[PDB]
Amino acid sequence: IPKHPKRVVVMADGYYGYFKTLGINVVGAPENVFKNPYYKGKTNGVENIGDGTSVEKVIDLNPDLIIVWTTADIKKLEKIAPTVAVKYDKLDNIEQLKEFAKMTGTEDKAEKWLAKWDKKVAAAKTKIKKAVGDKTISIMQTNGKDIYVFGKDFGRGGSIIYKDLGLQATKLTKEKAIDQGPGYTSISLEKLPDFAGDYIFAGPWQSGGVFESSIWKNLNAVKNGHVYKMDPIGFYFTDPISLEGQLEFITESLTKLE
């Protein structure tokens, strides 16, 4: 595996932002990347798209390093250039950045951003606790008749809100989506008032008339205008860039004037 690679093709959408932070020039990325508001938003200049299968499309980018998930034809790829397989969700998240930093010889770029990150977390943590106190906050997405109430270990700003910001959740949400389940809980539209907190970040599971039901409109959070539209594509990833964009949205939402 090359240190300081000059041309990297990333077939695992969820890692693009990692190499971008480190500064490794990426020459190819899957479609998701060109759809994420935290990416195309300003970071796409030098890359080709794709879906993650067309081995031929990677050939025309003559990479010196390929990165793909284990969950594609690795052998075919290993032929093109040094290829690295990354078991999904194996590394923590800030660890996954230090793995890539070490792998590419850019540990200074990674430790630098971590320093910036913790300075942003700390600042927002104090700015938010001041504006919401111990008020509770929910995270949920809709998909047909099912409604998912996320915890801290399942993306959608969960680890940000319940760990980095130390914000509280309703007893039932901690009991079900945290201290117990696989990281989330699918509930019925009836039990919504039982989970719903003071503030809510709701949105579709991807781009079921729940935001129409009389039971949702009647929730205290919505009545007090404390519900914020969560973009499913933006909260899809948890890379350094997306995390920054997500923490900005979380903070702004929870502190804008009423």
Strand content: 15-25%
Distance between the amino and carboxyl termini: 53 Å
Described by strand count, sense and barrel closure, the largest sheet is: 5 strands, mixed
**Number of helices, counting only DSSP H or I runs of 4 residues or more:** 11
The oligomeric state is: monomer
Helix content: 25-40%
Per DSSP E runs of 2 or more residues, the count of β-strands stands at 9
User: At the third CATH level, what is the topology name of the largest domain?
Assistant: Rossmann fold
Shape: globular
CATH homologous superfamily identity of the largest domain: Nitrogenase molybdenum iron protein domain
Q: What is the H/E order?
A: EHEHEHEHHEEHHEHEHHEH
Gyration radius, rounded: 20 Å
PDB class: transport protein
Keywords: alpha-beta protein, Structural Genomics, PSI-2, Protein Structure Initiative, Northeast Structural Genomics Consortium, nesg, Cell membrane, Ion transport, Iron, Iron transport, Lipoprotein, Membrane, Palmitate, Transport
Assembly: monomeric
Entry title: Crystal structure of the FhuD fold-family BSU3320, a periplasmic binding protein component of a Fep/Fec-like ferrichrome ABC transporter from Bacillus subtilis. Northeast Structural Genomics Consortium Target SR577A
